[PDB]
Amino acid sequence: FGRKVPSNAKSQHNFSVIPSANIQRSVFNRSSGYKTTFDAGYLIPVFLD
């Protein structure tokens, strides 16, 4: 008997894959000061980012 031929389904799938985004990451220092007055026993939110 004959041998089956391939399907194109894999190459069609590959054409549909979007490229990854190029992000442009960088490193920097984000130093900040904070000054306050508070009393004991409370949870004080001193840092927020």
Partner: peptide
Amino acid sequence: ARSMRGGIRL
């Protein structure tokens, strides 16, 4: 198996 166009559908 990569990031497909139109979002994911298996």
